[PDB]
Amino acid sequence: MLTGLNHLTLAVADLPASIAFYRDLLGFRLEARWDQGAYLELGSLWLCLSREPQYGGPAADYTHYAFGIAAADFARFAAQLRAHGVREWKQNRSEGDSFYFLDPDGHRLEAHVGDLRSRLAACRQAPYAGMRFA
């Protein structure tokens, strides 16, 4: 039986750029790097970067990766990414602040204020089409 998320690994075509983006823009700590990848850490999250050169980027789908952020930091984080001219892939329309941006390989990322608890509560008050709770 599984206990939670151990790590997340993303394929990256340009390793230096992906390190500079997650380290500098997003603030992960770089723990180690090597010719074929990097290990970085954001709080308790362990991020692997796996260098993969013919990597074309993801399928045009909704598969994506959301990081946490407290309510009072959200505005400045979004401004900071816009100031760095990071492209957005979707506009917000659900409970809680969300900023949706792309990484250097077009992986789909998200800064979100809220958690599963807050989502359910709100969904309880205003449920999605054909919604059912446990």
Instruction: Name the binding residues.
Output: 7, 41, 64, 110
110 catalytic, yes or no? yes
Query: Strand, coil or helix: what is 30?
Result: strand
| 16, 17, 24, 31: residue in contact with its own copies (rule CB under 8 A) | 31
Closest CA to 64 of 113, 19, 103: 103
CA distance 126 to 9: 35
Q: How far is the CB of 94 from its own copies (least distance, A)?
A: 10
Amino acid sitting at position 45: L
Contacting its own copies within 53-72 (CB under 8 A): 55-59, 61-70
Pairing of strands 37-42, 29-34: antiparallel
Give the binding site for its own copies (CB under 8 A).
Answer: 1-11, 26-37, 39, 41-46, 50, 52, 55-59, 61-70, 73, 76-77, 107, 110-112, 114-116, 119-120, 123, 127-134
